[PDB]
Design a protein around this nucleic acid. Structure first.
Ligand SMILES: N=C(N)c1ccc2nc(-c3ccc(-c4nc5ccc(C(=N)N)cc5[nH]4)[se]3)[nH]c2c1
Length: 91
DNA sequence: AATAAAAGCGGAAGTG
DNA sequence: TCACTTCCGCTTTTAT
């Protein structure tokens, strides 16, 4: 199956939802969600998974915080900003 | 100086 | 066993 952080990375490289997600420093690995359009993205996440209920950003973000222990994604002290790890980008 | 609102946190049970 | 999902409760930041 697919993993969460991959679903995000792909769009960031595809620009499929530029209105909902964008790079802050595409080199450093930072990205940020639109405070207004974040729901329309989490909605598409719950669709690609086929969950019983519709996916809300609050629930999706609850998943991101579980990447903290492994390092895949670490929250930033900024608003709605997270950071990928190097291994995911490539090396 | 208090607030209402938004963001963020995390345990626990549950799911495909 | 995984990778979340869902739920509820609390805590923290910000804007006004
Ligand atoms: N009214 C508004 N227009 C408004 C606008 C912007 C806002 N930016 C925030 C927050 C930013 C960071 C927050 C936060 N960092 C936390 C760390 C730990 C915990 C915890 N539970 N340990 C909780 C945390 N919450 Se909230 N709130 C806003 C409101």
């Amino acid at each position: 199956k697919i993993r969460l952080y991959q679903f995000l990375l792909d769009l960031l490289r595809s620009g499929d939802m530029k209105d909902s997600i964008w790079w802050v420093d595409k080199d450093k690995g930072t990205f940020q969600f639109s405070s207004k359009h974040k729901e329309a993205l989490a909605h598409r996440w719950g669709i690609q998974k086929g969950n019983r209920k519709k996916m809300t950003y609050q629930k999706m973000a609850r998943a991101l915080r579980n990447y903290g222990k492994t390092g895949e994604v670490k929250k930033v002290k900024k608003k709605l900003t997270y950071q990928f790890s190097g291994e995911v980008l490539g090396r």
